């Protein structure tokens, strides 16, 4: 509904890379602060050897005299691949583009500051909503691991720990919801019939 927030956190799982990058870039240039998690869980349409071939051509592309300066720095992390897409989609060689890049943050996995915050999702880039069911797709985590990313296992272990903590949190949440439903029934008896009928007519 075109809502403005302090910062929107996007769970990158199940998202198509280019479409999520487009939406994120437009939001950054409009003035929204964004934080993207699970870039390793991001998806790319097509087949894995197509993505790997594209990345290997990218690796071919290299400066001749001195790779240390000026050369195309090939980043092997999924967060940095997503950042490369967003940077290519915004004018990074201007102060406004630099400002948008400073409103953008990206991570692998879900850091502990963001594990307790609400993770949003963009329908316009969801794989299950965009891709035809029979088509093939690949994951940026697999691509990064096969092109030289060194921290796939550590991220997997941290995600497993986070999900165990989330399971405990969800047990507590279920207990709280049961208590809330019970109290609402008990209290209903001890509420004025007029308040209830009035609220029902008003739609609450």
């Amino acid at each position: 509904m075109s809502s403005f927030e302090s910062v929107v956190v996007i769970d990158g799982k199940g998202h198509l890379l280019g479409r999520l990058a487009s939406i994120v870039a437009k939001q950054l240039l409009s003035g929204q602060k964004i934080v993207v998690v699970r870039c390793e869980a991001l998806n790319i349409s097509g087949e894995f050897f197509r993505a790997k071939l594209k990345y290997h051509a990218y690796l071919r592309k290299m400066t001749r005299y001195n790779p240390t300066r000026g050369g195309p720095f090939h980043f092997r992390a999924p967060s940095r691949i997503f950042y490369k897409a967003v940077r290519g989609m915004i004018p990074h060689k201007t102060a406004r583009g630099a400002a948008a890049l400073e409103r953008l943050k990206v991570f692998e996995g879900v850091p502990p500051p963001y594990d307790k915050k609400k993770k949003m999702v963009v329908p316009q880039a969801l794989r299950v909503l965009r891709l035809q069911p029979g088509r093939k797709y690949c994951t940026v985590g697999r691509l990064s691991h096969e092109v030289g990313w060194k921290y796939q296992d550590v991220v997997a272990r941290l995600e497993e720990r986070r999900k165990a903590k989330g399971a405990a949190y969800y047990e507590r949440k279920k207990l709280a919801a049961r208590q809330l439903s019970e109290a609402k029934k008990a209290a209903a008896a001890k509420v004025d019939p007029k308040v209830s009928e009035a609220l029902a007519a008003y739609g609450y």
Partner: protein, 87 residues
């Protein structure tokens, strides 16, 4: 030369760092990996060689050996590291 020892620069530190310890598993006994010493020189020796298959097998060979003064080291601390997505 080899393009594997480039950017042919002076060592940033005089001590020299390990840069890689052998990988660790809990099944082995507790032990230390590295140690320190000071190069004193080198000298000549004769070893009765037992290299089955060599022409110097069961023969005396003259070899050059380097000698390292190694006074006992003192433990003064303990550091603990954690694994992160950045290393």
């Amino acid at each position: 030369g080899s393009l594997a020892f480039l950017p042919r620069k002076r060592a940033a530190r005089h001590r020299g760092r390990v840069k890689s310890f052998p990988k660790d598993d809990p099944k082995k006994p507790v032990h230390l990996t590295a140690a320190m010493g000071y190069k004193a020189g080198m000298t000549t020796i004769v070893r009765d060689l037992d290299r089955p298959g060599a022409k110097a097998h069961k023969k005396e060979v003259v070899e050059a050996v380097t000698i390292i003064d190694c006074p006992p080291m003192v433990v003064v601390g303990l550091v603990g590291y954690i694994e992160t997505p950045r290393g």
